Design an enzyme around this catalytic site. Structure first.
Site, PDB file in Angstrom:
ATOM      1  N   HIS A  44      38.656  31.751  34.656  1.00 37.96           N
ATOM      2  CA  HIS A  44      40.078  31.316  34.583  1.00 37.96           C
ATOM      3  C   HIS A  44      40.495  30.367  35.712  1.00 37.96           C
ATOM      4  O   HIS A  44      41.506  29.662  35.588  1.00 37.96           O
ATOM      5  CB  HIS A  44      41.039  32.518  34.477  1.00 37.96           C
ATOM      6  CG  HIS A  44      41.235  33.243  35.770  1.00 37.96           C
ATOM      7  ND1 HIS A  44      40.667  34.466  35.992  1.00 37.96           N
ATOM      8  CD2 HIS A  44      41.871  32.847  36.894  1.00 37.96           C
ATOM      9  CE1 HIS A  44      41.028  34.821  37.212  1.00 37.96           C
ATOM     10  NE2 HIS A  44      41.713  33.850  37.812  1.00 37.96           N
ATOM     11  N   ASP A  93      35.390  36.914  31.934  1.00 35.93           N
ATOM     12  CA  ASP A  93      35.993  36.093  32.990  1.00 35.93           C
ATOM     13  C   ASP A  93      34.982  35.885  34.096  1.00 35.93           C
ATOM     14  O   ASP A  93      35.058  36.494  35.168  1.00 35.93           O
ATOM     15  CB  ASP A  93      37.307  36.729  33.500  1.00 35.93           C
ATOM     16  CG  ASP A  93      38.163  35.783  34.296  1.00 35.93           C
ATOM     17  OD1 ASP A  93      37.827  34.573  34.353  1.00 35.93           O
ATOM     18  OD2 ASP A  93      39.149  36.248  34.894  1.00 35.93           O
ATOM     19  N   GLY A 186      45.740  34.082  44.266  1.00 39.55           N
ATOM     20  CA  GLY A 186      44.858  33.380  45.199  1.00 39.55           C
ATOM     21  C   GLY A 186      43.592  34.146  45.523  1.00 39.55           C
ATOM     22  O   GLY A 186      42.643  33.578  46.066  1.00 39.55           O
TER      23      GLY A 186
END
Ligand SMILES: COC(=O)Nc1ccc2c(c1)NC(=O)CCCC[C@H](NC(=O)/C=C/c1cc(Cl)ccc1-n1cnnn1)c1nc-2c[nH]1
Length: 238
Positions: A44, A93, A186
């Site tokens: 992602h 992912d 983050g």
């Protein structure tokens, strides 16, 4: 990282900060060194990333302030996203970055072991999530790499916590029932590192959660042991 503390230099030497150069240079995601030209991270992270030319991998970093125009980095030759990846919440992912040059191993930068397929049954009790992410939902990237120790959660308990999602065995969850410690904005792409028999293993890749460190909302990580064959397919291609 929410509820974490400052890491010490050299504590997580497989941790990298992946930066994007477009439109301006900034931290994009975390990642882990797994081989001398290989970074394991989240698929992602590359949403809207049209080319590997805008990417810079920095290893051996404790503080984001160590990064200036004259700081050495690794260029990215190739971005390899799992074929089945659609979105973080549906799994797969996972991505690999093939670096343009080789990482010279030392006390500041070295690889983390992948989990053993035979150790799919072992219970990890010493797991830590690391990153330069937010300390809460509305925050900013942190200068110093943070760490937080978090317990792993069974698939059954994680599924109870995420009504409306399908929590598969290709995902692994971690968090306290009461919340308080977790990954946040983050941190994704970074490692969930677990120490077993004095050896650190890359158990998870920070993926997603509903908010950060909320009560009864464990962080959801890509379950790396389920992708060991996929990683070997991509990194050991003849
Ligand atoms: C100055 O530099 C800058 O400010 N950079 C910068 C700032 C923020 C970002 C980012 C770059 N990266 C992206 O947007 C791509 C990547 C996009 C998704 C990424 N998701 C996470 O990192 C983690 C989520 C997550 C994971 C777990 Cl296990 C638990 C709870 C989670 N959260 C739920 N809600 N928030 N977190 C993110 N990253 C950012 C904003 N979102």
């Amino acid at each position: 990282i929410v509820g974490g503390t400052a890491s010490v230099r050299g504590e997580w030497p497989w941790q990298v900060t992946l930066h994007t150069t477009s439109p301006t240079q900034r931290h994009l995601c975390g990642g882990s060194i797994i081989g001398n030209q290989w970074i394991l991270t989240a698929a992602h992270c590359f949403y809207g990333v049209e080319s590997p030319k805008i990417l810079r991998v920095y290893s051996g970093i404790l503080n984001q302030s160590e990064i200036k125009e004259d700081t050495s980095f690794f260029g990215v030759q190739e971005i390899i996203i799992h074929d089945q990846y659609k979105m973080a919440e549906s799994g797969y992912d996972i991505a690999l970055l093939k670096l343009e040059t080789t990482v010279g191993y030392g006390d500041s930068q070295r690889p983390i072991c992948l989990p053993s397929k035979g150790d799919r049954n072992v219970i990890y009790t010493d797991c830590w999530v690391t990153g330069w992410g937010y300390r809460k939902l509305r925050d900013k990237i942190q200068n110093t790499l943070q760490k937080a120790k978090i317990p792993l959660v069974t698939n059954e308990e994680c599924q109870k916590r995420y009504r409306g999602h399908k929590i598969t065995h290709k995902m692994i969850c971690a968090g306290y029932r009461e919340g308080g410690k977790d990954a946040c904005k983050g941190d994704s792409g970074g490692p969930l590192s677990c120490k077993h028999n004095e050896v650190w293993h890359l158990v998870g890749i920070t993926s997603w959660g509903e908010g950060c460190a909320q009560r009864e909302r464990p962080g959801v990580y890509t379950n790396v042991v389920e992708y060991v064959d996929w990683i070997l397919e991509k990194t050991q291609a003849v």
